[PDB]
Symmetry: C2
């Protein structure tokens, strides 16, 4: 069994969000299109789309797909991460998994999972573990 775990940071460079439902409450449903950069061991760029359900301006859940293109050491390719997220008390966090059979290039035949927690200024710390087969 071979596993590779990477701990790092990402930077959000753009965040484009459009509501499709808004109630007097302050609750809303939105779609967000986000771009993020990764530097370090994991190096690349992601385009992400999330659907978000806000119960109020400070509390939401979000789900979606992150399309990563880049490299991890000698491996080059792309993959899709499926995200299950929460936004509470000014902090966004997510649990994600690599979508089976979504990977290309040197990332084929790998499973993976991880999480992230936001910090400040569009940054977040993440951990991801990729495993063979």
């Amino acid at each position: 069994t071979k596993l590779q775990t990477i701990i790092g940071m990402f930077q959000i460079t753009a965040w484009d969000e459009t509501s499709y439902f808004e109630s007097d409450n302050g609750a809303k449903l939105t779609q967000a299109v986000i771009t993020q950069s990764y530097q370090g061991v994991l190096q690349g760029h992601s385009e992400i789309r999330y659907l978000m359900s806000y119960q109020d301006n400070a509390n939401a859940t979000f789900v979606g797909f992150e399309h990563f293109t880049g490299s991890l050491g000698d491996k080059k390719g792309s993959f899709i991460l499926q995200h299950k997220g929460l936004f509470a008390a000014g902090v966004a966090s997510s649990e994600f998994e690599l979508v089976e059979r979504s990977a290309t290039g040197d990332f084929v035949h790998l499973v993976g999972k991880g999480h992230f927690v936001s910090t400040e200024n569009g940054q977040a710390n993440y951990q991801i573990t990729l495993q063979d087969s």
Copy 2:
């Protein structure tokens, strides 16, 4: 704790899907805007949005939110279901949960989760347990 489980069917009445990424493979990323109708003890209509990741035309995962407006007997209101779904072997299935603090009207304070499995003709069987 008093629990009740409702088992029924829903009918897709509209489904519009738009790709935002397509690969030479047949893989694609899409958004789907959907409407469904519910008849029975759970009676009403839902407006749904899903994001979908297709590995090929026969296999996909989907996630999103269903906004239901209607009644559950004498109780009237709305709520949001958060879905985690799979399409495989010609069957769509989802596990969902009622989003906390999303419910309105007589549905405030409802807690719940369930699943659905598609049948044919735009229909699916669902089960939902609420508190």
